[PDB]
């Protein structure tokens, strides 16, 4: 079939930093992929546009998607406040992997993370549903603004986002 492709235009303290596009594996994780896609277009009203990456740990991952509380404690899916873990077919095999952040089994909302390294210990706990297609260097560049505990030195936000294909 055809997997959706979405993009994120990143900005640091307002200054445009570049674009990152993802391939969502709708063929294997349809519901999870649809959720991310819809949140990227903003077709349901709420979405990712304007939200920031509140947690960046260099060498581990970049986390964002909490557009309601902006600190990892909020966010919601197009299915409600949270949906079940669709499946664990895909694994965290390396940099670029797009996975779902959560606070335990079946607590998927809108938060996600982009891996900047192989994080095998997350397999079976977080649903992998896509991967970076283009702009991986933009993701690595974002690490420059993170810290060991995740606190970011600058305001990293999703200036704009949408669907390409």
């Amino acid at each position: 079939m055809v997997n959706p492709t979405v993009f994120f235009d990143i900005a640091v303290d307002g200054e445009p930093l570049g674009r990152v596009s993802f391939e969502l594996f709708a063929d294997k994780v349809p519901k999870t992929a649809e959720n991310f896609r819809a949140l990227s277009t903003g077709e349901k009203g709420f979405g990712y546009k304007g939200s920031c990456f509140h947690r960046i740990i260099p060498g581990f991952m970049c986390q964002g998607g909490d557009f309601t509380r902006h600190n990892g404690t909020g966010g919601k899916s197009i299915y409600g406040e949270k949906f079940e873990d669709e499946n664990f077919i895909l694994k965290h095999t390396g940099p670029g992997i797009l996975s779902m952040a959560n606070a335990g089994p079946n607590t998927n909302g809108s938060q996600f993370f982009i891996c900047t390294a192989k994080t095998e210990w997350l397999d079976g706990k977080h649903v992998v549903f896509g991967k970076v297609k283009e702009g991986m260097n933009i993701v690595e560049a974002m690490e420059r603004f993170g810290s060991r505990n995740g606190k970011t030195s600058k305001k990293i936000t999703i200036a704009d986002c949408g669907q390409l294909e």
């Binding site: 952040a101 606070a103 909302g109 938060q111 994080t119 706990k125 977080h126």
Partner: peptide, 4 residues
């Protein structure tokens, strides 16, 4: 929300 994790990951830990």
């Amino acid at each position: 929300a994790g990951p830990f």
